Amino acid sequence: GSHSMRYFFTSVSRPGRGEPRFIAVGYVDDTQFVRFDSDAASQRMEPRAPWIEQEGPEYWDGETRKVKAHSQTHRVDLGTLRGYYNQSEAGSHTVQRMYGCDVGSDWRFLRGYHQYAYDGKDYIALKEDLRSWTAADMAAQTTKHKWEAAHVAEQLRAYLEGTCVEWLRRYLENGKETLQRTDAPKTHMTHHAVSDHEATLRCWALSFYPAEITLTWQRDGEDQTQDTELVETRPAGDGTFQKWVAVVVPSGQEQRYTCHVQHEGLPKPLTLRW
Amino acid sequence: MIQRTPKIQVYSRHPAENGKSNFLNCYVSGFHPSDIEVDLLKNGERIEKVEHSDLSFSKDWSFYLLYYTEFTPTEKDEYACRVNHVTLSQPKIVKWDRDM
Amino acid sequence: NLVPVVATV
DSSP: OOEEEEEEEEEEOOSSSSOOEEEEEEEETTEEEEEEETTSSSOSOEEOSGGGGGSOHHHHHHHHHHHHHHHHHHHHHHHHHHHHTTOOSSSOOEEEEEEEEEEOTTOOEEEEEEEEEETTEEEEEEOTTSSSEEEOSHHHHHHHHHHHHTTHHHHHHHIIIIIHHHHHHHHHHHTHHHHTOOBOOEEEEEEEESSSSEEEEEEEEEEEBSSOOEEEEEETTEEEOTTEEEOOOEEOSSSOEEEEEEEEEETTOGGGEEEEEEOTTOSSOEEEEO | OOOBOOEEEEEESSOOOTTSOEEEEEEEEEEBSSOOEEEEEETTEEOSOOEEOOOEEOTTSOEEEEEEEEEOOOSSOOEEEEEEOTTOSSOEEEEOOTTO | OOOSOOOOO
16 A cells, blocks of 8 residues: 655744754654654664664764754744744744655655644645645745745755655665554454443454554444544554444444444455444 | 643553553643643552653644553552643543443 | 755745
């Protein structure tokens, strides 16, 4: 199936003294592989997946240089944006950046992206064509003009279509044993009685990878959304994911309801019953 | 300022069985800004050895973090997660329900 | 592998 590499960056200004708190994380699909935290002792980009430890000193030096350069851009931006938005030096503010590339089943470039937010709101993003920018307001418009004049988009497009894809393919090969493996959900169903007349059925999916999954209920073979509760997919903490969906039913009628599980680790959709 | 309140799930890493080592998780998501206080509680008392994931965020820019600790469930011990955030008037406590 | 250059706003 398709694959992605994505980087996420957050800086949070610290008004009273010193530089912003800066945190960078890198993912391939749903697996974190690197981190940098400005509060940590090492002041290096750090491995977070065993397959990235294959990379030598030059990689780690280069990624450290680049991530610190990222941190400094964010520091400058926080000051610029405070000015653009006529804000005081009293408050804490946040910049967030996300960029990366998607590839299809053939591992060829599909999509690239680069977006930026200030205080949790869209500021500026590269359009799908990787040639122009979406600016949310007049502040971002000024940035857009700056970036157009300096041909920023051209440099980013080269990275997103080239380097990003090249290194993603490299990571997928080095981490093949886990990165190219699917873990099918382990499914079961639980029952709870709320009263003499009402029952809760809960359909569980555990230990699955990647995170994308669909869980639905049917009643007598037709989709049932009413009286259901579906939790957000959550990390187990060991690299796999969990999810559940529950339905409230009349006591004695449990037989009418079936849970249906779709996941890339399952060739056929799975069905469960009480 | 945009302000978004955290969603909280408290749960174990592996299927919960008394006497068998496991991990207790508190997953906090959908919040903004990023400053947040998360504690894991054993019988109402704050657990000291708690780790957390590196801060990341979803498409809509909202943050998420996983807090976790090693634990061995017993019949009698009650577990919970306590969350405070600028959006919350009082800390929010969610109890671990192993029966789900 | 991180982007070589990040432009300021």
